[PDB]
Amino acid sequence: TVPASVDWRKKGAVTSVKDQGQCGSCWAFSTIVAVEGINQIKTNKLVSLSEQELVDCDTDQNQGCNGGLMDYAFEFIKQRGGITTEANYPYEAYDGTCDVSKENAPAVSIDGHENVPENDENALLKAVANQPVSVAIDAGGSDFQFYSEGVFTGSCGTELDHGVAIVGYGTTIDGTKYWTVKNSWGPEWGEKGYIRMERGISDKEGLCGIAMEASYPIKKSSNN
Template sequence: MNIYKVVFVTLSLFFVIGFTNSFDYQESDLASKESLWNLYEKWRSHHTVSRDLEEKKKRFSVFKENLKHIHKVNQMDKPYKLKLNAYADMTNYEFLNSYGGSKVSHYRMLHGPRRSTGFIHEKTEDFPSFVDWRKKGAVAPIKNQGRCGSCWAFSTVASVEGINQIKTGELISLSEQELIDCNKENHGCDGGLMEDAFKYLEKSDGLTTEKNYPYRGKDEKCQISKMNAPMIVIDGYEMVPENDEKALLKAVVNQPISVAIDAGGKDFQFYAEGVFTGKCGTELNHGVTLVGYGSTSDGTKYWLVRNSWGIEWGEKGYIRMERDIKEGGGKCGIAMEASYPIKWNPNTIYGSNGSIENILKMVQ
């Protein structure tokens, strides 16, 4: 299997100097299976991945197959590149079960069709060529959901953090763990819908801070005492008209937007940089946050998407996804299930509906 030999030297350098756009190697660079094992050990050390001997043997086989795929894709003329990231010894099935988790398509069938709402951004007519809410101070640093299917909570929180900053001028990191523990319409680490999280926030009249209710990455009992503190308020939410990338553009011009995507496939798992044009379906299984858009120097249009898999994935935690494609649902279904919070009042403290009595009703 020459592919295993060919990539050894280049990928060894990868761990020292980081990912580059090309893999340059010669026949003299060929190495053995033993060298690949050494590469796997270096990868484990770099990512502090602990395995016993039997598990390592099994994972090494997965690692080799993933490496083969990464190398093959990177030799193609694609506008994006892949890399050996922290998930390199996981199968795609294992990866999605651990790090996806929104299961929007599944829960949408269980919970019924999308709510019909207004669309306050319908009349938006000013479309800058480039929008990046990070540069406007409305996006918190990248977070990491870990092995908990709580992406729906991270997507919800990021869009609430965004609209709160837009209205108040203050970026406050909010609690995903509160949603996991207390939003009973959703399913904690087993997935959920951003729409149902917004419903919870609208009725409970707020979300407490991450500092006050820190992330644990697992399902726990709702801690009411931690919610008796100043919370960020939203006044409601709306759904972006589905399968309409122009409507999605109108929405993100005004604020960060919660979106669901199909994050399946190895190319998404190992995405490193560039505009993602890879294969993906519309089986929505992952919640992320749309924080802008733009186009490359060659005119390729993209959406700027904030993920919740830590800063070592993608472009320091972000992915640029192809924009304005023929399919109405957008790349990976990004325009199928988009929503955003509404905040009219810049007041950041919970109001009359946010009493402990009302909170207790919400979490029971």
């Protein structure tokens, strides 16, 4: 039994829309949206977290401004005992040297992470009903890039190249199912920084491949 609709922004689990600037750190922003979300859901306190810490310190595989993957970032946060706040380690859109002093001041911890069964929007829906979910999509096309309003229905391929996060779902009055996605291109893009993408389409992969690589953090205890 999943609700007809869920809007994590309205429920108070989503921070302001950020802009990653000229640094290929979408993976870090995608990861942080999910962690900021589960944290508020568990502790009832919305805390803005550090994408910069990931860029500078999560280097085993991820490459800071040269790209990375959300799954590796969740692993990093799990292993470091947490991620520090944005205030303590602010985003400067560049490849910085890991500031150990700030990295060792975690503010929010997670127990691990798990993946949503691939190409299954129903499984994805159940996951989103619980918390914001990190997802990868093909954002390399013009239709997606110049999206401004309404429910985006295409056109986009499925070659994954951008990490974002689903912060909700619903159905417009006209009957169009959608996913509410938080992008990292500033509040100036789309609907105040978000994009409503058609949900439950005829392709198992989802629109722009949104159902191909979805994952989320795990947090059982209510403290930090």
